[PDB]
Write an enzyme that holds these catalytic residues in place. Structure first.
Site, PDB file in Angstrom:
ATOM      1  N   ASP A 254      59.920  71.696  25.530  1.00  0.00           N
ATOM      2  CA  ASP A 254      59.564  70.611  26.429  1.00  0.00           C
ATOM      3  C   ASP A 254      58.129  70.063  26.310  1.00  0.00           C
ATOM      4  O   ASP A 254      57.947  68.859  26.456  1.00  0.00           O
ATOM      5  CB  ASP A 254      59.843  71.049  27.866  1.00  0.00           C
TER       6      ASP A 254
ATOM      7  N   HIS B 163      67.957  65.872  30.009  1.00  0.00           N
ATOM      8  CA  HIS B 163      67.567  65.832  28.603  1.00  0.00           C
ATOM      9  C   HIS B 163      68.741  65.619  27.670  1.00  0.00           C
ATOM     10  O   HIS B 163      69.775  66.296  27.810  1.00  0.00           O
ATOM     11  CB  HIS B 163      66.946  67.160  28.201  1.00  0.00           C
TER      12      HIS B 163
ATOM     13  N   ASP C  42      69.179  66.819  24.777  1.00  0.00           N
ATOM     14  CA  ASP C  42      69.593  68.042  24.044  1.00  0.00           C
ATOM     15  C   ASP C  42      70.602  68.831  24.845  1.00  0.00           C
ATOM     16  O   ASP C  42      71.257  69.723  24.318  1.00  0.00           O
ATOM     17  CB  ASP C  42      68.423  68.927  23.516  1.00  0.00           C
TER      18      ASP C  42
ATOM     19  N   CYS D 108      66.199  74.935  24.385  1.00  0.00           N
ATOM     20  CA  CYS D 108      65.150  74.704  25.370  1.00  0.00           C
ATOM     21  C   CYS D 108      64.042  75.759  25.372  1.00  0.00           C
ATOM     22  O   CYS D 108      62.932  75.482  25.803  1.00  0.00           O
ATOM     23  CB  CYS D 108      65.738  74.598  26.776  1.00  0.00           C
TER      24      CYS D 108
END
Ligand SMILES: *CC(=N)NCCC[C@H](NC(=O)c1ccccc1C(=O)O)C(N)=O
Ligand SMILES: *CC(=N)NCCC[C@H](NC(=O)c1ccccc1C(=O)O)C(N)=O
Ligand SMILES: [Ca+2]
Ligand SMILES: [Ca+2]
Ligand SMILES: [Ca+2]
Ligand SMILES: [Ca+2]
Ligand SMILES: [Ca+2]
Ligand SMILES: [Ca+2]
Ligand SMILES: [Ca+2]
Ligand SMILES: [Ca+2]
Ligand SMILES: [Ca+2]
Ligand SMILES: [Ca+2]
Lengths: 624, 624
Positions: A314, A435, A437, A606
């Site tokens: 992030d 997000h 992803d 993540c």
């Protein structure tokens, strides 16, 4: 161009620069008919009548050895007149400002493409200085000869008579609009152009001389900087001492500042990152193994510097900048400024490692500003337009409302201003965290376009579970190996199926967004089985560990361990995913990330980051 | 695109918008072989095998009358199986967002040119409101129905079943990046989109409906605004009450904001401006006559509002903005903010008269920021590139130094961002005052390119004076009719001739700049005889009233009275200029401006301004 103006009432003294078109004004002070006789080094294109249409043009073959060593004689004759003569004494000089405008390592317009033209400048935003906190370009000094390698060569070449700069001077300049964006050092360093200084008198000796300059950029292309910097040499006549200096000749070099470029998962990995965290040793060991298999160095941020921040995806995105002479990786550091905040500044930024940031640093920050919400596609061709470095993808809402979120405008503008990966706004605001992803990854494939898009798919997970109940395993337990749930109960749960139908719509909207913007066909796409649930504000979270949120290390995939229903010895979710991907020649490893990551609303992708090999294709050969 | 996904385990309900490509997912929940039978209004392209390559596509011919009134039946049959059936109920609707995208008065990309596409928006920067100090667009209200004529029509058309908006809603939006630059009113006004609000739920009834919006822009194209505003309609499914709203369809209109455009002296005049000043009555009468001859209204700023500021050329430049539906003149008000400061705000800005300003208003201001330093060429074609609205010209130095001046960056950027008249930097810093109108004008011609460039020329004045001495008039007195000087003394004065040689170089540099940037040939150029002198900081001023600094009113020229040497009844300077220009069919009047203007470093062009006819060629047909 240049008009030399001649009279018979005086001889005139002029200079010609090689490569320039000089013209002669014969009529303005003439007194019928004229002939032109010139020294041997002066070639004259054009026994001639004084019609004001008469074009007379002068060209020199070589630099003068002495002042006035070439000569033109113009005589004005007629029907019964002996000649009135006008004399012109020329001095010829070479003044060439050169840079790598063909882009090999070595008009004044910059052009994109393989047949294009224009030199390239890197923003000198790395830190080759040992023990320092600031980027190299924050000051007007070259401290290490290593730093020169990041810079672009520019050379002034002059061939003049020895005494030439007794009456002429050369100045280097940049427009005031651009002086804040470039710095220029003269080589044997001290600066000649820069943010404090838009011009400088050069000290050049007569004869044959060559003078090197080293140029760096101080700013990436952005909203108010299209990214071109022009540097100009001007030759000034300074021979009358009362009168101001007169410009005799300018020439210029135009540079384009290199954009910041991302690397997709299809580029082979080089380095991995993650945090050491409390009870997380077995996550970290699992990644370590996978790195080894894919040939990657490995780096860990410890619990001291983390500030208990585990989300290594992030805070940053590792990209590169590229010039013929030098390619280096650069980190784009997110304004989210959480516990990982310093890690881009202290640990990543360094020798041949650039840095950049954007956005309000004291906050005013969504979660969509985290760099799990920044991806690139692989290279892709879309209705005949090539995006050879892929297209950047980032999450948004479908429309702006009071409750809706977005990636901050300054990052959005920065990415677009980079040009070379024409961003695409996807829809991710439906997800709790928000997000891209969370619902997409990309993996290398040995066929078709050489990749696949993986999309999270509830449908596929309903199908699997139904196919298992159909074959008698309705009693099988999700979360075997928290409260367990059986396939018959997951399936009959009507409200869970409404949520998943609504997630299905959200993912589907993006599927078609990617089908159009990215040129994809259904055979480019694989659906990964994935259930979601809606929680606070009807926002979506993973029902079980988000498999599509995976670490792609070439062919070695680090996929979150779904802990699915166990049938004939195996998690059927694991088996379904392996059946989807093993035929591509991918190797799936399933990493436990459940009490460590999944319950804190993220997974393996993540918890990590990757630096990858920059594209071999050179950004300046694109034609955006 | 849209995937409808069908199961045999349930019937599915979907909407199709006319003009959209709908596709059917038959395989994802199939159970071999299938056939498709659809209602009559649904046409299906594509007794068929279940190969995952199988493309099934659905198209509707017309809007539904009731919900689910079209129908698709998919049956999955095989070698020994009677059919399993999957049902799909469609509702078809029209949702067209329309604007004047063909540019007649009536892709989602905007394109330049005669074959291009995209609607146009005017910045609503005039003042149709009686008794008000602010531009119409400074507030979120439409106060006069006159104001709507400046705005661009956009229409939403819907054809739906009566009960359709029981389960769907429509929203209008602009990206947050652009909401500060547009305002949108819904017509029967109150705003629906604007700087406070990037989206709005529309209230539309089922059936056949048509809803008008009126759009204005709040900002001209500039450094951080390329000038496109996109407005989008999104159709939302709002039929599950727990779940968030789901987007079913977006469509968009892209507008381009009209640039601010100047008008050259070759455009026919419409209105004249100047000041009333102390002992200046005979200057003002002279202009009045000339206006009458050229058919122009006439406006004077009086000594009360002037604040003794006489330089009506400098504080403003009257341009226009242009859209298919509406063309209006707009004043670009210079930051020089001298005595004339208020005159653009109070007297010019008004009903069908726009306003704009740029630059630091509390100062940080050169004299090169005055609008005698802003001109446009006539239309001109340059090595095959057309500039059909001319190219803007403004004065600068040749390079930036400590002592050098420039037009302020914000004005420079604004003019470039306008695009359509690609500015050109000339060299005027050598002049004391520093304005391009000091050494150039343009006049209409009946031949060639339909104009001439007039350049100030000392050479031509030396030539004239020499030709007069040669014919015996050396005793003739400049300034006959201050200290008089004779032609023999002007001519023999060696230092005056050095100054004029240096001015000659400065003008010549620009001659060739204009020859290249503007496409000119020598037969496009006339030299006007003009002596200069160098004074403070070796900066140049007119030796006698600057004739090239003239008021061009079509064919009627208001030229400063040079008060030259009087030979056979006439000023030879006047006679030379008449001989240069009368063969073009121009009418020269010579206006006394000597103790009133010339001694305060300006002339007739500097004491005045003109509004002219906007170009017939429409800016959006250019391809910059
Ligand atoms: C896929 C991805 N980029 N995920 C990032 C999501 C993780 C964080 N999570 C948290 O901040 C969080 C949530 C619950 C409890 C603790 C924490 C924490 O570690 O601070 C996010 N939501 O952005
Ligand atoms: C051609 C043009 N645009 N000219 C403008 C030049 C006029 C002013 N002049 C003055 O400010 C001035 C000079 C001397 C004495 C009084 C004044 C005055 O009226 O304030 C300029 N130099 O900009
Ligand atoms: Ca440095
Ligand atoms: Ca460096
Ligand atoms: Ca940060
Ligand atoms: Ca380096
Ligand atoms: Ca990322
Ligand atoms: Ca208003
Ligand atoms: Ca208005
Ligand atoms: Ca003003
Ligand atoms: Ca109006
Ligand atoms: Ca002007």
């Amino acid at each position: 161009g240049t008009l030399i103006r001649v009279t018979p009432e005086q001889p005139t003294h002029a200079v010609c620069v090689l490569g320039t078109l000089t013209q002669l004004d014969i009529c303005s002070s003439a007194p019928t008919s004229f002939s032109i006789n010139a020294s041997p080094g002066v070639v004259v294109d054009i026994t001639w009548p004084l019609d004001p249409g008469v074009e007379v043009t002068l060209t020199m073959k070589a630099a003068s050895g002495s002042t006035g060593d070439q000569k033109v004689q113009i005589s004005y004759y007629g029907p019964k007149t002996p000649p009135v003569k006008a004399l012109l004494y020329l001095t010829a000089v070479e003044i060439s400002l050169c840079a790598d405008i063909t882009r090999t390592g070595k008009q004044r317009t910059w052009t994109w493409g393989p047949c294009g033209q224009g030199a390239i400048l890197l923003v000198n935003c790395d830190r080759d200085n040992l023990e320092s906190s600031a980027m190299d370009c924050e000051d007007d000094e070259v401290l290490d000869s290593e730093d020169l390698q990041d810079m672009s060569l520019m050379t002034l070449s002059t061939k003049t008579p020895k005494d030439f700069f007794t009456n002429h001077t050369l100045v280097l300049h940049v427009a005031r609009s651009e002086m804040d964006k470039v710095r220029v050092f003269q080589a044997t360093c001290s600066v000649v152009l820069g943010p404090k200084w838009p011009s400088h008198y050069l000290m050049v000796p007569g004869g044959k001389h060559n003078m090197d300059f080293y140029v760096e950029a101080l700013a990436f292309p952005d909203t108010d900087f299209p990214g071109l910097i022009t540097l100009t040499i001007s030759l000034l006549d300074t021979s009358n001492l009362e009168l101001p200096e007169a410009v005799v000749f300018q020439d210029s070099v135009v540079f384009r500042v290199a954009p910041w470029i991302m690397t997709p998962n299809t580029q082979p990995p080089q380095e991995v990152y993650a945090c050491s965290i409390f009870e997380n040793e077995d996550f970290l060991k699992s990644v370590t193994t996978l790195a080894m298999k894919a040939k990657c160095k490995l780096t860990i941020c410890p619990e001291e510097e983390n500030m208990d921040d585990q989300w290594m995806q992030d805070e940053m995105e590792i990209g590169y900048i590229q010039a013929p002479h030098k390619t280096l990786p650069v980190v784009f550091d997110s304004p989210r400024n959480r516990g990982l905040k310093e890690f881009p500044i202290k640990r990543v930024m360094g020798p041949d490692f650039g840095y950049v940031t954007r956005g309000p640093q004291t906050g005013g920050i969504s979660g969509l500003d985290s760099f799990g919400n920044l991806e690139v596609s692989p290279p892709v061709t879309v209705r005949g337009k090539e995006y050879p470095l892929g297209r950047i993808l980032f999450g948004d809402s479908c429309y702006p409302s009071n409750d809706s979120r977005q990636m901050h405008q300054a990052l959005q503008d920065f990415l677009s201003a980079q040009q070379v990966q024409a961003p695409v706004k996807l829809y991710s605001d439906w997800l709790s965290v928000g997000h891209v992803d969370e619902f997409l990854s990309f993996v290398p494939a040995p066929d078709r376009k050489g990749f696949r898009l993986l999309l999270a798919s509830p449908r596929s997970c309903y199908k699997l579970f139904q196919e298992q109940q159909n074959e008698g395993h309705g009693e099988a337990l999700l979360f075997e190996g928290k409260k367990q749930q059986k396939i018959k109960n997951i399936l009959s749960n009507k409200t869970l199926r409404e949520h998943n139908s609504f997630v299905e719509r959200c993912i589907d909207w993006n599927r078609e967004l990617l089908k159009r913007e990215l040129g994809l066909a259904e055979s480019d796409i694989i659906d990964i089985p994935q259930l979601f649930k809606l929680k606070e504000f009807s926002k979506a979270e993973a029902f079980f560990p988000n498999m599509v949120n995976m670490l792609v290390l070439g062919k070695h995939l680090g996929i979150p361990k779904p802990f699915g229903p166990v049938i004939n010895g195996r998690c059927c979710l694991e088996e379904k995913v392996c059946s989807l991907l093993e035929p591509l020649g991918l190797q799936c490893t399933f990493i436990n990330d459940f009490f460590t990551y999944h319950i804190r609303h993220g997974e393996v992708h993540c918890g990590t980051n990757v630096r990858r090999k920059p594209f071999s294709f050179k950004w300046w050969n694109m034609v955006p």
